[PDB]
Design an enzyme around this catalytic site. Structure first.
Site, PDB file in Angstrom:
ATOM      1  N   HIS A  61      11.198   2.970   1.310  1.00 12.88           N
ATOM      2  CA  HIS A  61       9.467   3.443   1.728  1.00 12.88           C
ATOM      3  C   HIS A  61       8.675   2.043   2.543  1.00 12.88           C
ATOM      4  O   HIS A  61       8.194   2.000   3.179  1.00 12.88           O
ATOM      5  CB  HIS A  61       9.245   3.811   0.878  1.00 12.88           C
ATOM      6  N   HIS A  91       3.148  -5.005  -1.994  1.00 13.72           N
ATOM      7  CA  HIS A  91       4.411  -4.652  -0.690  1.00 13.72           C
ATOM      8  C   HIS A  91       2.618  -4.132   0.003  1.00 13.72           C
ATOM      9  O   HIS A  91       1.430  -4.059  -0.148  1.00 13.72           O
ATOM     10  CB  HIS A  91       4.884  -2.927  -1.030  1.00 13.72           C
ATOM     11  N   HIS A  93       2.075  -1.306   3.609  1.00 16.54           N
ATOM     12  CA  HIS A  93       1.664   0.175   4.256  1.00 16.54           C
ATOM     13  C   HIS A  93       1.064  -0.767   5.512  1.00 16.54           C
ATOM     14  O   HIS A  93       0.653  -0.997   6.127  1.00 16.54           O
ATOM     15  CB  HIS A  93       0.692   0.786   3.251  1.00 16.54           C
ATOM     16  N   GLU A 103      -4.239   2.744   4.205  1.00 18.07           N
ATOM     17  CA  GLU A 103      -3.719   3.865   3.376  1.00 18.07           C
ATOM     18  C   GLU A 103      -5.845   4.547   2.697  1.00 18.07           C
ATOM     19  O   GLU A 103      -5.869   5.663   3.431  1.00 18.07           O
ATOM     20  CB  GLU A 103      -3.366   3.921   2.069  1.00 18.07           C
ATOM     21  N   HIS A 116      -0.820  -4.069  -0.886  1.00 15.68           N
ATOM     22  CA  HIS A 116      -0.693  -3.997  -2.493  1.00 15.68           C
ATOM     23  C   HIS A 116      -0.570  -4.509  -3.528  1.00 15.68           C
ATOM     24  O   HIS A 116       0.456  -4.487  -3.031  1.00 15.68           O
ATOM     25  CB  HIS A 116      -0.767  -2.370  -3.079  1.00 15.68           C
ATOM     26  N   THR A 195       0.242   5.540  -4.909  1.00 16.64           N
ATOM     27  CA  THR A 195       0.006   6.109  -3.620  1.00 16.64           C
ATOM     28  C   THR A 195       1.932   6.597  -2.914  1.00 16.64           C
ATOM     29  O   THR A 195       1.408   7.056  -2.335  1.00 16.64           O
ATOM     30  CB  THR A 195      -0.703   5.731  -2.629  1.00 16.64           C
ATOM     31  N   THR A 196       3.108   6.798  -4.172  1.00 19.84           N
ATOM     32  CA  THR A 196       3.665   6.615  -3.905  1.00 19.84           C
ATOM     33  C   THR A 196       3.930   8.169  -5.202  1.00 19.84           C
ATOM     34  O   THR A 196       3.726   7.700  -6.004  1.00 19.84           O
ATOM     35  CB  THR A 196       4.555   6.130  -3.347  1.00 19.84           C
TER      36      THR A 196
END
Length: 257
Positions: A61, A91, A93, A103, A116, A195-196
């Protein structure tokens, strides 16, 4: 299983994770004309001098840069927080195009990416217990825009070809996350979620106002990662972001006037 694809993306996650439609979901849009300055907020304390990175992992992901969290080595304190929160991983996004990828949004603006830095509250003893608590995690979120290169990011960029596909990891010691921070620690804060999946409502969000810059060449190397495993048809790891969720009965507070 869940992802960011044409048939398993964010709009489907509620079927396996009903909390996706919960009261304190993340990310959110930050409306700078309704977030209010909170003079009771204290300065953020980012103490990363003793941080011990260990490994980098493509989890299918995103990729995680993992730290030794078995002692108070890299901690976040202050700000809206009570207590001490230990860095476990960071990590990102990012998007397929420079106009999307973040996000959180700021007055509906999407940035090219978002970092994040995930920390857990040491009063709960381990990460898995922390995520079961409303004040279990503190996530430092940092926006990325495309412009000048970020020298502090190049070691990460450098290693991505060794973790191209899902399940691959590589040693990643002696990485200094201070090189990913903007000049200012001015922030917005609100209560929210991961958020996952599993989307747990355990996070005090701390979103920095000032973005960092990365170069087009740096972002392009993120976009060469793969969601798939080795030996499988290539699906580029892009657009691995959840869109903004309803604010509901929450207020976003600003640390700055």
């Amino acid at each position: 299983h869940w992802g960011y694809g044409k048939h398993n993306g964010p709009e489907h996650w509620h079927k396996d994770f009903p909390i996706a439609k919960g009261e304190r979901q993340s990310p959110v849009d930050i409306d700078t004309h309704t977030a209010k300055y909170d003079p009771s907020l204290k300065p953020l304390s980012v103490s990363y001098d003793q941080a011990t990175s260990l490994r980098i992992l493509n989890n299918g992901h995103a990729f995680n840069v993992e730290f030794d969290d078995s002692q108070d080595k890299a901690v976040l304190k202050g700000g809206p927080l009570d207590g001490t929160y230990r860095l476990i991983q960071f990590h990102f996004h990012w998007g397929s195009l420079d106009g999307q990828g973040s996000e959180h949004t700021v007055d509906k603006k999407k940035y090219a990416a978002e970092l994040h830095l995930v920390h857990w509250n040491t009063k709960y003893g381990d990460f898995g217990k922390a995520v079961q608590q409303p004040d279990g995690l503190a996530v430092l979120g940092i926006f990325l825009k495309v412009g000048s290169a970020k020298p502090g990011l190049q070691k990460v960029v450098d290693v991505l070809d060794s973790i191209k596909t899902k399940g691959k990891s590589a040693d990643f010691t002696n990485f200094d996350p201070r090189g990913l921070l903007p000049e200012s620690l001015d922030y917005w804060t609100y209560p929210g979620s991961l958020t996952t999946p599993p989307l747990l409502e355990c996070v005090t969000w701390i979103v920095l106002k000032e973005p960092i810059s990365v170069s087009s060449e740096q972002v392009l190397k993120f976009r060469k990662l793969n969601f798939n495993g080795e030996g499988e048809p290539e699906e580029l790891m892009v657009d691995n972001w959840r869109p903004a969720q309803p604010l509901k009965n929450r207020q976003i507070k600003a640390s700055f006037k």
